Each structure stands twice: as structure tokens, then as C-alpha cells.
Amino acid sequence: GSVREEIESLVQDSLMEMVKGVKNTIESDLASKKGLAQSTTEILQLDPTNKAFAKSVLESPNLKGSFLAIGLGYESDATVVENDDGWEPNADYDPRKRPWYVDAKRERKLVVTEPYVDISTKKIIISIGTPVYQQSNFVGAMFYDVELTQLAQLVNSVNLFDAGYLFITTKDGVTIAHPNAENNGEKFSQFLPNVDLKEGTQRIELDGKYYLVKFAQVPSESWYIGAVVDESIAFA
Amino acid sequence: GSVREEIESLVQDSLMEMVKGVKNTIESDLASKKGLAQSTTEILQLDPTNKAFAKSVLESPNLKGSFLAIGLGYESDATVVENDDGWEPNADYDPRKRPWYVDAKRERKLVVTEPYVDISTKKIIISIGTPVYQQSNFVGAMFYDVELTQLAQLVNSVNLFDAGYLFITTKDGVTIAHPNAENNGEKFSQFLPNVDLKEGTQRIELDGKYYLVKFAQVPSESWYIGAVVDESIAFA
Numbered sequence: 001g002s003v004r005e006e007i008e009s010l011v012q013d014s015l016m017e018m019v020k021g022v023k024n025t026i027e028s029d030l031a032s033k034k035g036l037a038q039s040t041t042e043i044l045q046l047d048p049t050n051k052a053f054a055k056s057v058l059e060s061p062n063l064k065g066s067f068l069a070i071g072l073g074y075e076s077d078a079t080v081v082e083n084d085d086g087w088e089p090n091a092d093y094d095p096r097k098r099p100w101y102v103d104a105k106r107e108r109k110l111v112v113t114e115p116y117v118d119i120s121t122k123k124i125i126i127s128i129g130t131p132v133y134q135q136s137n138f139v140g141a142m143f144y145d146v147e148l149t150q151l152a153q154l155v156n157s158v159n160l161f162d163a164g165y166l167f168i169t170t171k172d173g174v175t176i177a178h179p180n181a182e183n184n185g186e187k188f189s190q191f192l193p194n195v196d197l198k199e200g201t202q203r204i205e206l207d208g209k210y211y212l213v214k215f216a217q218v219p220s221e222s223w224y225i226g227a228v229v230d231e232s233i234a235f236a
Numbered sequence: 237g238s239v240r241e242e243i244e245s246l247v248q249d250s251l252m253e254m255v256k257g258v259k260n261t262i263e264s265d266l267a268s269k270k271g272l273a274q275s276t277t278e279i280l281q282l283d284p285t286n287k288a289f290a291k292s293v294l295e296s297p298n299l300k301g302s303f304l305a306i307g308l309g310y311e312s313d314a315t316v317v318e319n320d321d322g323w324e325p326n327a328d329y330d331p332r333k334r335p336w337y338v339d340a341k342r343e344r345k346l347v348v349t350e351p352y353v354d355i356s357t358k359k360i361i362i363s364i365g366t367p368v369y370q371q372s373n374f375v376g377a378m379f380y381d382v383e384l385t386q387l388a389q390l391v392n393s394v395n396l397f398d399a400g401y402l403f404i405t406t407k408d409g410v411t412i413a414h415p416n417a418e419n420n421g422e423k424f425s426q427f428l429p430n431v432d433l434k435e436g437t438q439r440i441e442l443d444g445k446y447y448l449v450k451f452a453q454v455p456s457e458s459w460y461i462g463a464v465v466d467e468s469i470a471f472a
């Protein structure tokens with residue numbers, strides 16, 4: 001009777017502690033990626049039209065090792081410098097048309113894109129985009145690609161194993177990271193039907209098993225971190 | 237009787253959860269600082285003897301805003317490029333003698349120094365030091381200074397207010413960060429006597445008040461994060 005509610009207290013408190021820990025992990029990874037992007041862009045702005053300098057920066061190992069891919073597209077001749085070993089842009093690739101470029105140019109600051117199809121890996125990715133200025137003139141934009149399987153591994157750092165999993169969506173419920181990447185770029189409702197996108201805990205039924213969904217928001221980009229938990233397994 | 241031990245359980249579990257949260261904060265800040273240092277050094281290694289290029293990089297706003305001060309000392313002519321607005325090196329300043337330089341040269345990789353007296357701010361600081369190479373030749377070293385009051389504010393992010401505080405020491409018990417900076421660079425025993433430096437919880441007496449000390453280690457640099465908690469206030 002009162003133990004039921006005591007147990008419920010323990011369960012909800014531990015879910016929220018688990019999710020906030022994961023939320024801090026995501027915030028920390030994002031902030032450090034943004035800081036790197038911001039500094040790299042500022043450094044390239046010392047001589048932005050110097051393609052040889054730009055390539056050298058993007059090929060430097062720590063930076064190259066921090067993102068799936070990095071590149072700079074130019075507003076003038078639609079050319080692109082990038083550090084993707086296994087990709088060279090087609091004759092009809094135009095960076096100015098790409099969402100990282102459009103977002104960065106529109107907002108005139110560092111942006112994180114919505115999920116979109118990568119030209120190189122043909123997968124859903126997200127990118128950090130930044131504008132590049134030559135003494136107050138916009139001369140192009142940069143992308144810093146983020147691999148989403150890696151992001152999914154990160155939110156599932158804590159290992160819920162067979163008890164459940166964590167995922168990430170945008171503010172509009174579009175999936176950013178999930179153990180099955182096939183969900184990425186789609187509305188999260190396709191693997192969690194009739195679940196509202198809001199902070200807090202929801203209890204749902206399928207079969208005659210109960211599941212707990214906990215959402216928490218990442219303020220910087222308004223992402224939602226979600227956890228799905230099998231009660232029977234997680235609290236046996 | 238059994239409630240006493242139940243209460244003890246709650247207290248110890250919540251202390252450890254508080255400290256591990258703070259430990260992750262420190263680890264995340266350090267890793268992002270190290271990543272920035274590593275990339276900045278690699279970028280400067282594109283043309284390390286170019287003092288004008290080097291200065292331009294160190295003056296770029298995101299990087300300049302991420303550390304108290306940044307500089308590069310050269311092995312050849314003992315000259316130094318730095319971004320400290322309120323400091324210019326004396327005629328007898330020799331970077332090659334400084335602990336960030338000696339540590340970086342000795343270890344041939346990114347290092348975090350022991351606490352030491354800053355030449356510029358005349359305060360105890362720590363630095364990230366990195367070696368600089370010109371095609372496999374050592375041409376000098378860099379410092380990335382870390383202000384310790386800022387570090388103390390960070391470990392005390394969570395606000396224990398009048399219930400207590402957190403601090404940081406090296407593996408040898410030398411204080412790195414404390415609400416009173418006067419403790420920095422000294423053995424922590426001067427504000428916590430008869431307390432062993434080890435992971436776990438210790439209960440101590442002064443007057444007839446009880447205090448809880450919890451230590452947790454930061455693996456990367458073997459720092460210890462400590463929390464001192466007034467039981468009477470924190471668990472009233």
C-alpha cells in the first residue's frame with residue numbers, strides 16, 4: 001500500500017537522476033564541439049580564402065578526429081575544402097544549397113542543423129554550421145558533421161542493456177539519435193506511439209507490460225533526451 | 237534503530253551522487269580545455285616560428301576567452317608570444333625555466349602542471365602545457381593558464397551554501413581549488429586535519445559537530461574532488 005508509493009518514489013527519482021546525468025553528458029559534448037568549431041572558424045578567418053591554409057587546419061589530427069567531417073564552402077565560386085578522405089564533391093555539388101550553409105548564413109552565427117541526409121555517407125547526420133567572414137564580408141560557411149550512431153552510443157553510455165534505452169529528438173519530435181539509426185530523421189512516434197513530447201514521466205502499456213518514458217530538455221538546442229524503461233526488467 | 241541506518245544510507249548515497257556529478261563536470265571542463273589546447277598547438281605547428289601568426293591565433297576571441305592566458309615560449313631565443321593584456325615579460329623572464337615548459341618538454345605531450353605561482357597575476361594557478369614541434373624538432377612550448385577561483389566556482393556549481401563546500405587537490409593532497417584561494421598550493425590538511433586522502437566517506441568531529449568528507453578521483457590527472465558537509469545543516 002504505502003510501499004507501492006515508496007517504490008514509485010524510488011523509481012521516479014532514479015529515472016530523473018539517470019536522465020539528468022545523460023543530459024549533462026550531451027550538453028558537455030555539444031559545448032566542447034561548439035567551442036572547437038567556433039575557434040576553428042575564427043582561426044580560418046585570419047585568411048579565409050587561403051584554401052591551402054584552410055585544408056591544413058581541417059586536416060590537423062585533433063580537429064579531424066573530433067568530427068565525422070569538416071569543410072568550408074565558398075560563396076563566390078561554390079568551391080569546397082573538406083577533410084573527408086572518402087569523398088570528393090560532384091561537379092554539381094553546391095555547398096550554398098546545403099542546410100548547414102543556409103542555416104549559418106541565415107542566422108549569422110554558429111548553428112546546429114536539423115537532421116538531414118549527408119552527401120558523403122548517405123546517412124542522416126546533423127552538422128554544426130558556422131559563417132565565415134572576411135573583414136565583415138560573408139565569404140562562405142563551414143560544416144562540422146556529427147555522426148549519429150556515435151551520438152546514440154554516447155546517450156546510451158549508461159548501459160540499460162535489456163532494461164531499455166535512451167534516445168534524442170529535436171524540439172519537434174524528430175529523432176536525432178536512436179539505437180536503431182533507421183529511426184533518425186523520423187518522428188519519434190513511430191517507435192513510441194501516443195507519447196507526448198514533454199518533460200516528466202509517462203507510463204505506457206503494450207501487451208500487459210508497463211514501460212516508463214522520461215524526457216528532459218537540452219536548453220542550448222532544445223533537444224529532448226528520452227529514456228524508455230521496461231519496469232519488469234529494470235526494477236526486478 | 238533501523239531508521240538511523242536507513243538515514244545513513246540516504247546520506248551516503250546522496251553524497252556520492254553529488255560528488256560524482258561534480259566529478260563529471262570537472263572531467264568535461266578539463267577534456268574540452270585539453271581538446272582546445274591540443275588543436276591550437278597543432279594549428280600553430282603549421283608555422284610555429286611565425287610570431288605574427290601565433291599572436292593572431294592566441295588573440296582570437298573564443299580561444300582567448302577560454303583561458304586566463306595563453307602563450308608560446310621559444311627554445312632558441314627565449315622569446316615569448318602571449319595574449320595577456322596586462323603583462324609583458326621582463327628582460328630576465330625565461331620561459332624555458334617555467335614549470336609548464338619544463339613539464340611539456342620532459343613528457344613530450346600535453347601536460348597539466350602542479351600548482352605554481354603565476355608570473356603575471358602573482359597568484360597560484362595551474363597550466364596546460366604543450367610542446368611545439370617543427371617537423372619533429374622541438375622549437376618550444378605553450379601554456380594555457382587556468383584561473384583557480386574560476387575552477388573553485390565550477391566545483392561549487394552545486395551550491396552547498398552554509399551546509400558546506402567542495403574543493404580539489406592533486407594526488408599528493410596539494411590544494412588546487414578552494415573557496416578560499418589562500419589554501420591553493422598548500423597541503424589540504426591545513427583546513428582538514430587528520431583526514432586521509434582516499435576515495436570514500438569519512439566522519440569527523442570538531443567541537444561536538446559532525447562533518448562528512450567525501451573524496452572521488454578524477455582519473456585523467458589523478459585529482460581528488462573533495463566535499464566537506466555539515467551534517468546538522470545539510471540533513472536538518
Ligand SMILES: [Ca+2]
Pocket residue numbers: 082083084085086087088
Ligand atoms: Ca575529400
Ligand SMILES: [Ca+2]
Pocket residue numbers: 318319320321322323324
Ligand atoms: Ca602581453
